[PDB]
Ligand binder design. Structure first.
Ligand SMILES: C=C[C@@H]1C[C@]1(NC(=O)[C@@H]1C[C@@H](Oc2nc3cc(OC)ccc3nc2C)CN1C(=O)[C@@H](NC(=O)OC1CCCC1)C(C)(C)C)C(=O)NS(=O)(=O)C1(C)CC1
Ligand SMILES: [Zn+2]
Length: 199
């Protein structure tokens, strides 16, 4: 009831990336925890952004975000309604869909965007926050099975990351793990068509 002391949530902050530009996939950190905390409060991030897949953080969570068609997409359960930090101050979401667990902001200058897949192919690849590439067979509009199941620990923090086709197009955004006895045998993802409709 005391508005003058009500706090504001900070921005989502880009803290690294999954580098996919060469022959080896690897995670890079571009900002530490202390600098992330300060950037989240100000919303002013002057760091150079590169690549398609970003590692992002709030004060309490860390996850991924993926650029497709000029929009940096991630999950609502990670970002909520938060702004993203940017060189000129906080930037408001341009898409928010809690029913799909989806949000998006204009893609940062310097990022590169994935192209939405039109191959109609079901041999996919999930990219995790540790730069593991996980073969996934598509099993429906929004589901795929891991060829080699993994404990959910291995997937935790990778929501917002991409599923790609063999040609490297974006097929979907990783949303939730399909888990029994803590082993992920399948994944739930936001299909790129749903992004394209949301757009
Ligand atoms: C392990 C890595 C996972 C990718 C990951 N995802 C999650 O943990 C998501 C968030 C939440 O699901 C949702 N929450 C929502 C919340 C909303 O408004 C608040 C609105 C819409 C939402 N829609 C969904 C689906 C639960 N869940 C799951 O996966 C759960 N399995 C599940 O529910 O399966 C069913 C059957 C198959 C379909 C759904 C599980 C039990 C924890 C494994 C991950 O990495 N997250 S994350 O980065 O660590 C981190 C928490 C961000 C930091
Ligand atoms: Zn494709």
């Amino acid at each position: 009831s005391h508005m003058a002391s009500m706090k504001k949530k900070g921005s989502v902050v880009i803290v690294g990336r999954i580098n996919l530009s060469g022959d080896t996939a690897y995670a890079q950190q571009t900002r530490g925890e202390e600098g992330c905390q300060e950037t989240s409060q100000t919303g002013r991030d002057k760091n150079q952004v590169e690549g398609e897949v970003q590692i992002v953080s709030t004060a309490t969570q860390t996850f991924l975000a993926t650029s497709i068609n000029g929009v940096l997409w991630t999950v609502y359960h990670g970002a909520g309604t938060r702004t993203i930090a940017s060189p000129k101050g906080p930037v408001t979401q341009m898409y928010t869909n809690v029913d799909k667990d989806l949000v998006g902001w204009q893609a940062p200058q310097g990022s590169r965007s994935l192209t939405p897949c039109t191959c109609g192919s079901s041999d996919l690849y999930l990219v995790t926050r540790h730069a593991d590439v996980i073969p996934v067979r598509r099993r429906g509009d929004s589901r795929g099975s891991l060829l080699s199941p993994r404990p959910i620990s291995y997937l935790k923090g990778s929501s917002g990351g991409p599923l790609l086709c063999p040609a490297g197009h974006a097929v979907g955004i990783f949303r939730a793990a399909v888990c029994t006895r803590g082993v992920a045998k399948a994944v739930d993802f936001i299909p790129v068509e749903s992004l394209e409709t949301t757009m």
